Structure formats: structure tokens, C-alpha cells
Amino acid sequence: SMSQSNRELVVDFLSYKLSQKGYSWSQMAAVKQALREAGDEFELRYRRAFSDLTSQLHITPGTAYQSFEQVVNELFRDGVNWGRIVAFFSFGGALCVESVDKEMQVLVSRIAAWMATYLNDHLEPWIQENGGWDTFVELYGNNAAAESRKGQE
């Protein structure tokens, strides 16, 4: 409704301005902001190493799911870790941007669902065995990865 949208807008803005000062609106908001930052950083490290190969997947409606499935299964074959989970979000992101680029906007909503389902059915086990997302925030909050790279520079 109108009250819900105003509330949601107040919450989003306050969450942002709090995180700008090192605070957080809520534990969820802190996870979201650490994850965005880790995404930015993973994409920066990826693009410095390798070329953007998204176009080379040749996304189509018929192939979109199997493409997603195969990249993600290969990403987690050897095991799971926070960095690989960040890679999974980034790939989902690159996958959605490509879908819009190639005028298949509707795949964004489907890619989002494939991602949530994979999180529920295949990553949650490991996530709960490894401290939950609060532990992720402990490792990646305050833009930790980007700083760990800025140190070596």
C-alpha cells in the first residue's frame, strides 16, 4: 500500500546513510551492503584478470537456464566458500545485465528465482555450517576485500 511504500523508502534511505557512517539499519542491511561491496570488488578483480565473456555464452530463452546451471555447478564442484558465493552473485548479476542488453528483460525475474532456489537448496547447508551470513559480514564488512587488495598496492 501507500504506507508500506513510504516506510520501505524511509528504511532504504536510512540504511544507506547509516552505512555511510559505519552503522547499519539491521543485520540484514549489513549483509546486503557487505555483499554489494564484495560484488564490486569481485567484478574489479575479475575484469583486471579476464575479458568479459558474457556475450560468448550466447544467452537465449531456450539456453538461459542450462547456461546458468552449468556455470554454477562448475563454480561449486570443488567445494564452497564465501568468495565463490560472491562469484555466484556476480555471475547472476552479469547474467541479468546481459539479458536486458539482449532485450530479454523477462529473464531477470527468472534468473533471480534460479539464484534464490540455488541459495535455498544448495548453499544454505554450508552457510549454516560456517557461521551464517553474520560471519560473512565479519569477513567482508567495511569493504574488507577491497582494502586487503589496497594494502598490497
Binding site: 569481485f42 566458500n81 562469484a87
Partner: peptide, 24 residues
């Protein structure tokens, strides 16, 4: 592994960078 599996390749490249970002 297989050279035509651009999809497996991308997964492995993601893994490599994922491992790198996971190092502290």
C-alpha cells in the same frame, strides 16, 4: 576441462577469482 565448454570454463574462472577474493 573440455575446450568447447565455454560454460565450464566461465565457472572455473569464477572459481579462481572467488578463491582470490576469499584470501585475506
Amino acid at each position: 576441462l573440455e575446450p568447447n565448454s565455454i560454460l565450464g570454463q566461465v565457472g572455473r574462472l569464477l572459481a579462481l577469482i572467488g578463491d582470490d577474493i576469499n584470501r585475506r
